């Protein structure tokens with residue numbers, strides 16, 4: 001029958017393709033979900049979607065939106081409210097057995113405009129064979145990096161922050177964790193330098209950024225434009241400390257089996273032969289997973305995101321993907337139905353274990369079978385309970401562009417002056433000027 005188009009980031013194409021096929025198996029030819037890939041960066045995903053929406057592309061049905069786009073897609077009319085479900089089942093499905101942080105990312109003006117499907121929070125990833133204890137705060141991060149440098153060991157502090165969204169996420173985590181915030185509650189005012197407490201928070205966050213930027217043996221990938229990967233940097237042994245979304249767990253196990261991790265030769269274990277499936281996805285059996293994980297644990301460990309205020313955990317910036325139905329769709333009923341099918345318990349288990357994307361279903365974090373395969377469940381749920389959030393605003397696109405342009409390169413940050421420049425550019429963004 002009809003085709004429901006499902007637009008997702010390209011790096012999550014395969015995963016969602018698999019999920020879509022599963023859901024296609026449960027409709028009996030009544031309709032078919034077809035996944036379509038968007039670019040890699042949140043901004044370009046947004047741009048493609050916005051062009052199809054303003055272009056009245058009536059073939060656009062379901063969209064996997066980054067959490068930061070809700071405000072814009074709701075205010076524009078692009079994302080239909082879940083209350084526009086003809087069957088009226090969308091809102092109840094979205095809130096049922098779903099963590100409250102994701103649900104908050106999916107809302108605007110007291111209405112849900114999307115159903116969360118995946119969430120995200122960044123953890124610390126370290127080489128337990130080179131680091132006897134994972135640092136619990138950022139000055140400890142810097143000290144460990146310097147000490148590793150004073151031993152020929154890899155000294156990078158791999159953070160996925162080039163000159164875009166990831167850098168803004170780093171800054172927002174540091175700022176909120178320092179007690180600050182980019183915008184007021186209502187999003188109408190800039191709160192980076194408007195009180196001494198807020199200014200102090202911004203200055204501290206900028207100071208951490210600069211100190212990581214200029215720490216002995218730091219990244220020479222910060223001082224230019226090339227979209228480098230902190231994940232691959234860690235997997236290539238160039239870094240013994242990384243902060244990154246938890247998909248790097250799956251990747252590390254997968255690429256180590258494909259032979260792509262020098263310090264973790266899972267490819268040389270006979271029992272893991274064939275654990276890669278015909279589409280290239282690491283799909284171990286239970287015993288194969290025990291083998292791979294217990295071998296990984298000698299060179300790969302995870303820990304909470306490093307705090308800024310020692311003695312209390314950080315407020316880590318939440319990310320992820322919410323399923324929205326485009327206002328262009330021709331079959332609202334089937335779009336919302338497909339949304340409900342894409343986020344069910346089975347496909348959530350899959351999107352987490354195979355796809356590396358944290359699920360939004362709370363039951364899974366209380367599920368022992370899931371916890372045994374996702375050993376980072378407790379820290380992820382705890383950081384999502386305590387999560388920092390980026391400002392929900394219809395002008396987040398321009399806001400993030402301006403903030404990123406000011407923050408990069410982080411080697412040129414001067415905390416006070418940079419704080420003032422940041423507040424001024426954010427003011428420009430929320431003034432509807434660029």
Ligand SMILES: O=C(NC[C@H]1O[C@H](O[C@H]2O[C@H](CO)[C@@H](O)[C@H](O)[C@H]2O)[C@H](O)[C@@H](O)[C@@H]1O)c1ccccc1
Pocket residue numbers: 009010011012040041042066067068119120160161165166169229245246247318319320321357
């Ligand atoms: O952090 C980076 N960009 C900001 C977004 O990060 C995540 O999304 C990105 O990573 C996930 C993997 O967990 C992919 O699935 C997404 O497609 C990708 O956009 C957060 O989920 C999202 O909320 C943030 O907006 C980043 C990291 C590394 C290199 C470049 C950019």
